[PDB]
Design a protein around this nucleic acid. Structure first.
Length: 183
DNA sequence: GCTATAAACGGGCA
DNA sequence: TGCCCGTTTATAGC
């Protein structure tokens, strides 16, 4: 599955779930010692839990965004704990349309990269302006994934809805990275 | 921390 | 409309 012998580590998962019931955000902010609520700044109650370590953004619509988990399973579990906390605050919340929205991964190929040469040979997919950001932004089309490539050989892979896309994008880029290994 | 990346969410504003 | 508003996370030069 990983011909490269390297498996990108999952670092952050963004998911959403529909609690399916309108929410009184001021009421949640009061009853919960866990919550943070600043309406003029953002229309959401910000809640956090230690295990799995995540941050939830809860809206009046009943929609909820779960961030920070290390896996899809962890992200769903976390979203479930938030749903229960809300149910317990006195809201008839369900757990409708749970959906993984973004998976962020990273790995180390353990060799330096000639970013400029790589960008020049893949102009249609590359954005490299070292004065603004030290990483080369590689917008792959298949799968539709963005990789941030650094001189150190460290790689960030983001935009995936399924972990296999994270893996395929890395496998696709591996031989390109090797071709432009800084010697 | 600022710079940049992806994604979801909502209120506010030109 | 189409932005930024928020939060998360790896990464690194400023």
């Amino acid at each position: 599955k990983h011909p490269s012998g390297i498996v990108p580590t999952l670092q952050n998962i963004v998911s959403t779930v529909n609690l399916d019931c309108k929410l009184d955000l001021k009421a949640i902010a009061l009853q919960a010692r866990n919550a943070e609520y600043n309406p003029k700044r953002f229309a959401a109650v910000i809640m956090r839990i230690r295990e799995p370590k995540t941050t939830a953004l809860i809206f009046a619509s009943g929609k909820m965004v779960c961030t920070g988990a290390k896996s899809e399973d962890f992200s769903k579990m976390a979203a479930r704990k938030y749903a229960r906390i809300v149910q317990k605050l006195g809201f008839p919340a369900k757990f409708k349309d749970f959906k993984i929205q973004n998976i962020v991964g990273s790995c180390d190929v353990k060799f330096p990269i000639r970013l400029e040469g790589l960008a020049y040979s893949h102009a249609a997919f590359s954005s490299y302006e070292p004065e603004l950001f030290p990483g080369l932004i590689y917008r792959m089309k298949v799968p539709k994934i963005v990789l941030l490539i650094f001189v150190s050989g460290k790689i960030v892979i983001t935009g995936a809805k399924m972990r296999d896309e994270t893996y395929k994008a890395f496998e696709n880029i591996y031989p390109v990275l090797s071709e432009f290994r800084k010697i």
